[PDB]
Amino acid sequence: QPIDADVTVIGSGPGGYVAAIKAAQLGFKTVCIEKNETLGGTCLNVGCIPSKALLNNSHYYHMAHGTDFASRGIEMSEVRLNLDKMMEQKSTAVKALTGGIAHLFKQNKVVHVNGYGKITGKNQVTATKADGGTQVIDTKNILIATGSEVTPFPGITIDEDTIVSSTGALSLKKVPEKMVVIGAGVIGVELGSVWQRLGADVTAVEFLGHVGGVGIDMEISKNFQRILQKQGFKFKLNTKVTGATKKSDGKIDVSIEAASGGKAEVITCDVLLVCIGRRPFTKNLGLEELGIELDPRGRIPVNTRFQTKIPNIYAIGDVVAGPMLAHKAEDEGIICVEGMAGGAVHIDYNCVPSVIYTHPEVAWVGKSEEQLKEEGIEYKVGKFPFAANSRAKTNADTDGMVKILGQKSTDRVLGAHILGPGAGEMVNEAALALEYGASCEDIARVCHAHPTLSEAFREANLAASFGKSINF
């Protein structure tokens, strides 16, 4: 009972489902295979979505439980946390969005196949269901979008009970009294902050000397960290974990040392969150018997059209090089399918923004000062504190600033770094400017609504260009 198609996509995550949909909209008879019970992949089921929901709810809980709401005249009896109900709102959003992709597939006539995909020929893929059921698909093209998985920590075994990955951390059944987070990258900081707000004593341990992962501007990272610590989130930077032990009372002893050796100590916790990182997932995809060899990092090498060695088999998203971000996977999935239909495929990765959804948020696009210095590019710096922005001061939410990096002579915008209110949304104005090769002047010229947080972005650009802003 085989079936055929022009493009068969393996994986229904940001990259995969978006690729399948676009493929169909381009006319390709499309099929999308997924081994899990729902579509959407990592981002939707155990990544971006669930985490942003708990970040939103925990932020509000914090506003009500702490001094914020009182300062605005909103007075309450006793602010109580119903964790299960908070978890329910998160689950409801995720369920709605998973259902949505299923509906978007039927609407664009994308054929959904349930099972584990395995390339069984240069123009064939065999999906195998859990029950054993099999389904063959003969295709002109094959699109690999198998995404990623949690990178295990050598010597520590995640069980999703007291030792959890981000997945287990998104579903704890009670607020843990004390939590240790291994890794202070974006995911770690976000989840750490979620539980800290809900009442947990939280400490993140990190090998490197800064939080926020790769690419974050140092000044931004340091300012961000200072704020989080002021919130009660603790950090142990330049520190290595040497092991963890489950204890008689269910707690966990995590032994650590300075990264350079020495300063050995033990810190005990109720829950240990391991999130040193994530890595390409390609288990039993059939890449071996096809001659497709991975790079040292486990990624699938591809050209600018996302083609693997075997030219009719492509790869996109978390399973290939570049930022492991949802929007990055979506763009690749889009231009790849457009490429299959003769479209252009050049994508400028210097224009992919990054966002940390804590409060304050952090978002950036382009290059950090460190990168400019490394590439020896001469530059100008424009800074504008949210404490000087009207909407931020009116809202009584003034942490951070907007820092603009401009080419010292061409006044071209090289980097935009945002720490504070609305950073997440604001970075898209920044992204669009870079895609147009904007100059600080260009942005400074645009009329921004008053009062808006974006005016901080406009004025930081003015301070870079002209050398002085208006309100600071």
Partner: protein, 43 residues
């Protein structure tokens, strides 16, 4: 300075923007310029 999409259109049809002239705000080679070249070529 090519506008996004203008850059996309030029790549899809292997054209060099130098061949045309930028007719857009503050020195931008717009989606219209890109198309005027795909036309004023395949014309």
């Amino acid at each position: 300075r090519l506008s996004p999409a203008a850059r996309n259109i030029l790549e899809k049809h292997s054209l060099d923007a130098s061949q045309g002239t930028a007719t857009g705000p503050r020195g931008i080679f717009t989606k219209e310029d890109a198309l005027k070249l795909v036309q004023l070529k395949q014309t």
